[model samples]
Target: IKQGIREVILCKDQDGKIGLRLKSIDNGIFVQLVQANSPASLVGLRFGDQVLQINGENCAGWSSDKAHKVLKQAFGEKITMTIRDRPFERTITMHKDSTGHVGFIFKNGKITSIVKDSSAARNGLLTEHNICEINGQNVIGLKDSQIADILSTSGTVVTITIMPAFIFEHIIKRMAPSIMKSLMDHTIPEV
Candidate 1:
């Protein structure tokens, strides 16, 4: 129910960089990274946004390399981009009882169940939420046991960053699973 196509202009800085990174998600180009305090980030370009057009050309199917080239070509001049917004993200902090249970079942990084009248239930954690981060650590591509241990061993107060599983699954399904693994590995540097 939430979507928009808004035009954003990014002007390259003195370094001739707009401070945006693009990646091909499936056949579509998406905003993968944005450097802090740069033109891209300043203009509100964020991760997971689909780049529909760039500089008057449809870039939906453009490769990341191609997009970068375009940005480079437009250096010194402002670049216009059409961005499409996707789903939302949520972060919730919940406290555990003496038993160290948040009252939620976690499986494969997804919240599989929420016990009634539990901390999670009272804290607004939903059953379909996908756990993206636990206590400020990103859980992407982490094993189920690793994520579970992080959750179980956390302090009395555990904060989790989550997104709708439906949208998360759809986004990941379009790309190679290794994308997340490499992302978590910090192998890819920003542009």
Candidate 2:
């Protein structure tokens, strides 16, 4: 292997539609560029950098199934890619993590409170932070419920990149109502 393989996988829920009912839909694929930690990041691959190709394969407008096939074949193989940063274009090489998981969250609303010892809080992620991307997937208008479902499936150690905003909003919005209800009923608030 050169370093890491670069590929895109078709995403689908049990229904088999390209539209993952609960996943972020803005980006057709999800990517992770860990700050100074991953090859993708070191190679100037920032979050949200769309993959226009893999090795020499064009992936534009590819169906979810085709994308999955491309990724499966490229696993553990060094690959080259042409990525676009808005109007700018760049070529990069990256190795995919073997775990088949990317750590990030995409949620609507502002980050209200971060647990003191949580991965986010420990990384200086603060309340009112706007979650613009998750594992490189754009999340401009995704519902909090949808974000929650995705995050719930990720690993514990996550890298959350956010934009700090001053909106006096809670970080966890979807669960606020349920948490309050539980608190009032002494049923242990949901965190």
Candidate 3:
């Protein structure tokens, strides 16, 4: 599976800058961090977005310094970037007890509680983690009741994949350009 491409339209800040840091690793440029209250954050420029193209320039294999220089040199009021979302998910394998429970409470697909001295406690499932898969099937987009039913009826051992609720929400949100345009603008910070 490939991380799909997304186009982001960036707005410049007062200083004509973008408010984020970039890192070069393995011949790729990736977003390291985004400043709070910056236009990038407000417009949903997520951490680890792999820069693929910038302002019609193919960015694959560009050095971190080159990317930084190009971003600074571009003088447009709106900067467009093509990016790929990085994989930020993991699976937890948990064995159910004699009671056949993972010992976690979930509300609306997000973990609401984790019982003490339970399988979930030992397995590292955390509160506010959104369940994305069960066994080997994607469970996102399923109703809370359906998710609960699948969990309750599962076997002794189950593998669950999860992501932080914030990241999960952003991935699913996929806001349109029109929606993001309302958010304010920001400039990228130098490396």
Candidate 4:
């Protein structure tokens, strides 16, 4: 019994750009895989999440084509997805919001490396955190040179976000009582 609508902003993946990978499941369409650093992954679209809504449109019980059509309708742009994980429901918004360099490397079609002591590490960029966006642009499914061109955009400061491998573990497990989930209580979903 945990869920909440938290916004997760990302841009693209080393493989270019796309939304979450989905497949038909028992009750509805479920998330199968998320683009490494794409919005879906950044927002925490893990191995399996039931599709509830796209943007504001209902997707539950819809055919696979119908679901994909709705998803593509809002493709290449910001999207809001309301999902259910039984007794748990959450709205995750994935957007293009990368605007800095923290010195991470997007290679082999995914965020592969992070430079130590670079702007990335200084700003809390994790090695496992995927480089999703650059200055608010969809870079997934694109080529390296293309990603570089966008990241090369002008900006005085940088702002980057990612789908941390264990975001909930530390924030929830570290604190004595300050934990977020501590869950199903603090409403911490499967973070």
Best by lDDT: 1
Q: Candidate 1 regions off by >4 Å?
A: 1-87, 185-191
Q: Can you write out model 1's per-residue Cα lDDT over 1-191, one digit (the tens) per residue?
A: 12678898878888887777777766778765555557776676655568889888888677778988888887467688888864356678999988888899878778989988889999878877787767756566678887887878788999887878876776555445565554442112244
In model 4, the Cα lDDT at residue 102 comes to 47
Query: Worst ten-residue run, lDDT, model 2?
Result: 16-25
lDDT of model 3, residue 68: 80
Off by over 4 Å in 4: 1-51, 54-101, 164-191
Each prediction's TM-score against the native?
Answer: 0.58, 0.32, 0.49, 0.40
- Candidate closest to the true structure, highest TM-score: 1
**Pairs in steric clash, model 3:** 17-187, 17-188, 18-187, 18-188, 19-187
Tens-digit lDDT track of model 3 for 1-191: 13588888888788776776666655767665555466676566655467788898887787767888998888758788888865556678988888888889887679989998899999878988887668755555556787777877888988887778876565445334332232312222323
* Tens digits of lDDT, candidate 4, 53-73: 666776657766677666655
Clashing residue pairs found in predicted model 4: 11-133, 12-132, 15-141, 16-140, 16-141, 16-142, 17-140, 17-141, 98-135, 102-120
Candidate 3, which segments miss by more than 4 Å at Cα? 1-3, 88-191
The candidate, 2 or 3, that scores higher on lDDT is: 3
Q: Specify the poorest-scoring 10-residue window by lDDT in model 3.
A: 179-188
lDDT of 3 at 42: 58
